[PDB]
Design a protein around this ligand. Structure first.
Ligand SMILES: NC[C@H]1CC[C@H](C(=O)O)CC1
Length: 279
């Protein structure tokens, strides 16, 4: 399948070269998989989600996304126009309030929730979790991310936006999950992207167009935007049967475009997520 005039990041995911604008992908499009977006919520009524999004948990007085960030991330995973995996099921877990803030205790509870709740959901092709959040190092936060991964969920986490080594951030620094840095449309490391040996992969993160609250769209930047590209890619590849939740981060790294990014510090992987689709 081909989506013309796609956002640059989707085109980049499906290309061996920068500078193209069509997204190419197998039409299965993640059908039968499910992706949990653990964030500020998802505006499930947005036309871009086509009924495939649903809030399943909140830790606040409402399940509504009053911020926009969670809706944007969910759109990059799975919206019809802005999403990698256009037929996946999206499940919202609101661990961040409408100012984008949340306690680590709440974030941990949300991760434990997904590890159990997946067993109440029909996801025959596999389960992914996208965590576009983090803060300073916490052993408890890393352990919760490691538990979620071990339960059979492909966990993708943002490296962080401090232009610093991600070893000092959580859940970015947990070795067993998939830690995602950000690149721009000229194949440069994004100016804010964290780096370091803990990173597993880069995805598009600068100037990413996706869904927003109020039935709208906008472009924003962050490792928070690169993470759902990788999460959606994992759901897409799992639906194709190419990999599993336990192996998808390694598979994405094995099949990535290698050596194409600039301003990668010595010691950080030079790997850009790629779907390897040939029509
Ligand atoms: N691993 C639990 C979750 C993944 C798929 C499973 C199934 O589809 O049989 C039930 C929900």
């Amino acid at each position: 399948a081909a989506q013309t005039n796609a956002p640059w990041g989707l085109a980049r995911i499906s290309s061996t070269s920068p500078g193209t604008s069509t997204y190419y992908y197998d039409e299965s499009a993640g059908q039968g998989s499910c992706v949990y977006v653990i964030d500020t919520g998802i505006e499930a009524s947005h036309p871009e989600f086509e009924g495939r999004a649903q809030m399943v948990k909140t830790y606040y007085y409402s399940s509504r996304d009053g911020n926009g960030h969670g809706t944007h991330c969910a759109g990059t995973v799975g919206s019809r126009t802005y999403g990698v995996a256009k037929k996946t099921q999206l499940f919202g877990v609101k661990v961040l309030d409408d100012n984008g803030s949340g306690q680590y205790s709440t974030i941990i509870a949300g991760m434990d929730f997904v590890a159990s709740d997946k067993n109440n959901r029909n996801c025959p092709k596999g389960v992914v979790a996208s965590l576009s959040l983090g803060g300073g190092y916490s052993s408890s936060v890393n352990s919760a991310a490691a538990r979620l991964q071990s339960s059979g969920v492909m966990v993708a986490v943002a490296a962080g936006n401090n232009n610093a080594d991600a070893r000092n951030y959580s859940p970015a620094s947990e070795p067993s999950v998939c830690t995602v840095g950000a690149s721009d449309r000229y194949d440069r490391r994004s100016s804010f992207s964290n780096y370091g040996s803990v990173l597993d992969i880069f995805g598009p993160g600068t100037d990413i167009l996706s869904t927003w609250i109020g039935g709208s769209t906008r472009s924003i930047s962050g490792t928070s935007m690169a993470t759902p590209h990788v999460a959606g890619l994992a759901a897409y590849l799992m639906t194709l049967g190419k990999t599993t939740a336990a192996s998808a981060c390694r598979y994405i790294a094995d099949t990535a475009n290698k050596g194409d990014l600039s301003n990668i510090p010595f010691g950080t992987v030079n790997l850009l997520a790629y779907n390897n689709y040939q029509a």
